[PDB]
Design a protein around this nucleic acid. Structure first.
Ligand SMILES: [Mg+2]
Ligand SMILES: [Mg+2]
Ligand SMILES: [Mg+2]
Ligand SMILES: [Mg+2]
Ligand SMILES: [Mg+2]
Ligand SMILES: [Mg+2]
Ligand SMILES: [Mg+2]
Ligand SMILES: [Mg+2]
Ligand SMILES: [Mg+2]
Ligand SMILES: [Mg+2]
Ligand SMILES: [Mg+2]
Ligand SMILES: [Mg+2]
Ligand SMILES: [Mg+2]
Ligand SMILES: [Mg+2]
Ligand SMILES: [Mg+2]
Ligand SMILES: [Mg+2]
Ligand SMILES: [Mg+2]
Ligand SMILES: [Mg+2]
Ligand SMILES: [Mg+2]
Ligand SMILES: [Mg+2]
Ligand SMILES: [Mg+2]
Ligand SMILES: [Mg+2]
Ligand SMILES: [Mg+2]
Ligand SMILES: [Mg+2]
Ligand SMILES: [Mg+2]
Ligand SMILES: [Mg+2]
Ligand SMILES: [Mg+2]
Ligand SMILES: [Mg+2]
Ligand SMILES: [Mg+2]
Ligand SMILES: [Mg+2]
Ligand SMILES: [Mg+2]
Ligand SMILES: [Mg+2]
Ligand SMILES: [Mg+2]
Ligand SMILES: [Mg+2]
Ligand SMILES: [Mg+2]
Ligand SMILES: [Mg+2]
Ligand SMILES: [Mg+2]
Lengths: 117, 76, 94, 58, 136
RNA sequence: GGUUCUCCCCGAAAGCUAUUUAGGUAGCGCCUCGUGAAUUCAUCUCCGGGGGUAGAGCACUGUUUCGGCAAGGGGGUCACUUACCAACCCGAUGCAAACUGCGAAUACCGGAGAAUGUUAUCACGGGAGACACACGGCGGGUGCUAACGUCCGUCGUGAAGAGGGAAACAACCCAGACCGCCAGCUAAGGUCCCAAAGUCAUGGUUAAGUGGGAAACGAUGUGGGAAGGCCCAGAC
RNA sequence: UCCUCCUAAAGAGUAACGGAGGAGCACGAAGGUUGGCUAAUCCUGGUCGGACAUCAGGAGGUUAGUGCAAUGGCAUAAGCC
RNA sequence: GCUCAACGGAUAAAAGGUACUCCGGGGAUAACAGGCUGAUACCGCCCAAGAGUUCAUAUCGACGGCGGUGUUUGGCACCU
RNA sequence: UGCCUGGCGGCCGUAGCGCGGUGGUCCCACCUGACCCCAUGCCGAACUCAGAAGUGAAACGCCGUAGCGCCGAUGGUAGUGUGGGGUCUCCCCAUGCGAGAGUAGGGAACUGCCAGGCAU
């Protein structure tokens, strides 16, 4: 299995469970250069809020978009953006990535900024 | 060698069909494996018995990339 | 050049088709191209004799239906399980 | 609805349970018995199940 | 004499023999011998008939056997009562439905094939008829 | 084994389960009587369902034949080769209760609705009887697609059902007898005489008393139909 | 006595001294959870090494595996750490 | 704490003989004969490779096929 | 609004496979480095971290293409409920339902949310 098909397999179980639970998930996507965060509604097809390093307002304050400091910036931003829209309780979907390093920097910052999970 | 044996029948099968209104907890199908899978508001017991987790109507569907059979329960 | 005389069928299904064959006729069908399929009925002895010449299965035939001429080719054929008889024919519009 | 007349034309003896039950639903009690019923698909459906032993007049 | 080399199971329900045949065209040879009646062909019958047609052509040309006796038939011997287990397999039959091409042949003149198939048919317990290849 | 007066209403079972049980018995099913309760139940129509059966098919599991291709094995070398056998694979052809990349009719569960049906439904309670079934139809196992055989499923009838028909003939066809009639119409089945009703009408077939028992197979019996070969360049 | 399949007639059930098999145990991990992983078979290459051990690539795609019979399941694995 | 496995487990505890026999029952169930069946048997036929120096059918006939009888060996358990 | 890309879903092969072409500013990918976070029953392959010298080779995406997969009628055929019938191991007739396979043919998916790059 190639890296990607392998990760999607790694992600399927947790997503079905969250789907079953009807949870609003904070979905993360990581790349060597960029990291992305999306709060998606239980229907699985609507993005309520989002943040990432490909948007200039965020990458502008960052040294390198593909590291842990950046991950902390993205996480903090989704949280804020999300809280301002009344969104508070979500579930973390690490999307087949280890709960670690960058993903965990993003998660920790998102919690820091009041997002509940 | 000699034949002459069999076991008691286990009465597996569908207990509530499409459209039937059931109370939560009601067994919808007894099966040996997951011929049918648990969908929304339906649970899977240790012998793969599918049961209602909510009051409502039984609903059979076919879903996903493997064309699998799912039983769910619709509020009525 | 084969010339087959046909009438359009007034019925369809198993009952009607067996009644045709008890009456020394047999059903057939014409399909292909833009027009709708045309269900027809044929004289058995006349087409039996015709199709005993290889030319039938490789030449452009003409079916005449209500004094209209349809140019076709034989496409498939169902024969009786064990008698020298025809049960049905597909023609494709040529 | 519109009214039709239904007459039983053969015996019920020896018939399938479901047919007896269908005669009962029509209210036919015996050979020759004529009954006035409404012309609904539900009624036509019972006539149809036992059509071999009833005659309809419209 | 034809027989399955091995089978999943030794014995078989009697079953029934309804329907028309599959494999009703001459698909390998030039001529065929076709069943017109319904019934069972035993392996010995199939063999007796194969011999006859093969004498008849002096082992010239080529012969195909479209049927295969894959149904085991059991019997209970004399002086045994009913029950006490299903009988023992004694022989093998093919189930025949109207329309089955039984044997095919080619590499010989039609006249000789008809003769050979005539000799063979006299060995069989079901009426048959002579058939030919057909374009389509 | 036998069990004694009369009339009326309803009306089974010969199945499951358990049984030192198997021709006994018990619970349940099925009968009856009473009390109570729902639009309770049945048929049909429309609506919502799951099927893996008939049939089919051959990707799967097995089996099967023909052709191509082919590792491998058997034989000869003193590594190479033989008219041998050859799985897999490709193309073609079948078979399957314990095969399914397909798949009905029906049947069954559920919703809603009318008509009909003496509540036909469910609950509780008083009384049981019954747990040897038979034949016939359909779908099967067993047997020999033997048995007036045997074992299940499902319907019918007998059982516990008279009357008409099948010569006679529980179980097949028609049909369900409250009583009386020296009226009438029909069902299956029939209409020359025994014997109630056509020696009916019309078009054909048969010449065998076929009809009114029996297969492979044999044959210038005879009727209908569509084609073909040879032929006044003289065919048979 | 018990389990699996067929007979069993596409809901349940359904008989015969009908057709085939199995159980009367195992496991403190072979249970729980988190995290991860993915068979069989064949072709080619490779010390000893052979038809078959372990190594590499390719085809393949669950035909493997499941403590054990059969059937139904199983990749989100129920399989393997 | 029972392989009470005859597994809803009669007792904690149990094998045989009867041609010396006996009672209650059954044609619910065997032996004779009848009946149903006809695999088996018996009799006949269909095909014809082959035997018969030559030649299938004078006399026979392999591999297979279809029947008749009720008639042997059996099946069934309908009558007693 | 238009093209392009990423993410998350609907749908579950008319949507897949193959073959040919094609893309790197952006995105994606490979990639660079690895003491360290973290990892290998060995291995920085994978997981992971710090990055940006190189390349779209592979992968991925897009466009094309009927070798295959897939979908697929009409008509006939098989079966079958009910009623009737025959020469009743099997069939036929009336009526209703009506496959499977095959044939013609279709087919190189469709679609929503958010974000990024580009252009008018
Ligand atoms: Mg019909
Ligand atoms: Mg009464
Ligand atoms: Mg006891
Ligand atoms: Mg419906
Ligand atoms: Mg079948
Ligand atoms: Mg071959
Ligand atoms: Mg009661
Ligand atoms: Mg008893
Ligand atoms: Mg009994
Ligand atoms: Mg019985
Ligand atoms: Mg009997
Ligand atoms: Mg009695
Ligand atoms: Mg009389
Ligand atoms: Mg009365
Ligand atoms: Mg008279
Ligand atoms: Mg006579
Ligand atoms: Mg069932
Ligand atoms: Mg059923
Ligand atoms: Mg385990
Ligand atoms: Mg996990
Ligand atoms: Mg090797
Ligand atoms: Mg017991
Ligand atoms: Mg003595
Ligand atoms: Mg003495
Ligand atoms: Mg005595
Ligand atoms: Mg007796
Ligand atoms: Mg006797
Ligand atoms: Mg008996
Ligand atoms: Mg007597
Ligand atoms: Mg790397
Ligand atoms: Mg490239
Ligand atoms: Mg096209
Ligand atoms: Mg249709
Ligand atoms: Mg369909
Ligand atoms: Mg179709
Ligand atoms: Mg198809
Ligand atoms: Mg945009």
């Amino acid at each position: 299995m190639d890296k990607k098909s392998a990760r999607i397999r790694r992600a399927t179980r947790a997503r079905r469970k969250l789907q079953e639970l009807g949870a609003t998930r904070l979905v993360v996507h990581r790349t060597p250069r960029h990291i992305y965060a999306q709060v998606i509604a239980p229907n699985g097809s609507e993005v309520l809020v989002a943040a990432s390093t490909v948007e200039k307002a965020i990458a502008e304050q960052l040294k390198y978009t593909g590291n842990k400091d950046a991950a902390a910036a993205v996480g903090k931003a989704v949280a804020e953006r999300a809280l301002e829209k009344g969104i508070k309780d979500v579930s973390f979907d690490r999307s087949g990535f280890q709960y670690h390093g960058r993903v965990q920097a993003l998660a920790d910052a998102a919690r820091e900024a009041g997002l509940q999970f | 060698t000699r034949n002459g044996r069999d076991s008691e029948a286990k009465r597996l099968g569908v207990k509530r069909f499409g459209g039937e209104s059931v109370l939560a907890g009601s067994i919808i199908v007894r099966q040996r494996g997951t011929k049918f899978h648990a969908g929304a508001n339906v649970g899977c017991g240790r012998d793969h018995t599918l049961f209602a987790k909510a009051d409502g109507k039984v609903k059979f569907e076919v879903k996903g990339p493997k064309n699998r059979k799912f039983i769910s329960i619709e509020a009525e | 050049m084969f010339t087959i005389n046909a009438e359009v069928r007034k019925e369809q299904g198993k009952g009607a088709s067996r009644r045709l064959r008890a009456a020394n006729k047999f059903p057939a069908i014409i399909y292909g191209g833009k027009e709708a399929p045309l269900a027809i009925e044929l004289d058995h002895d006349k087409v039996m004799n015709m199709q005993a010449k290889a030319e039938f299965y490789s030449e452009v035939l003409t079916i005449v239906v209500d004094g209209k001429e349809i140019k076709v080719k034989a496409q498939d054929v169902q024969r009786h399980p064990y008698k020298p008889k025809l049960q049905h024919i597909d023609f494709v519009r040529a | 609805a519109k009214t039709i007349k239904i007459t039983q034309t053969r015996s019920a003896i020896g018939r399938l349970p479901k047919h007896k039950a269908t005669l009962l639903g029509l209210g036919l009690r015996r050979i020759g018995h004529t009954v006035e019923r409404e012309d609904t698909p539900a009624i036509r459906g019972m006539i149809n199940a036992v059509s071999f032993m009833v005659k309809v007049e419209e | 004499m034809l027989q399955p080399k091995r089978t999943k199971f030794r014995k078989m329900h009697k079953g029934r023999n309804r329907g028309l045949a599959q494999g009703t065209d001459v698909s390998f040879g030039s001529f065929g011998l076709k069943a017109v009646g319904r019934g069972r062909l035993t392996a010995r019958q199939i063999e007796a008939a194969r011999r006859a047609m093969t004498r008849a052509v002096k082992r010239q040309g080529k012969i195909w056997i479209r049927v295969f006796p894959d149904k085991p038939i059991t019997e209970k011997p004399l002086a045994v009562r009913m029950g006490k287990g299903k009988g023992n397999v004694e022989y093998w039959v093919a189930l025949i439905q109207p329309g089955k091409v039984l044997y095919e042949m080619d590499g010989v003149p039609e006249e000789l094939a008809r003769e050979a198939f005539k000799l063979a048919a006299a060995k069989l317990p079901i009426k048959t008829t002579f058939v030919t290849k057909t374009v389509m």
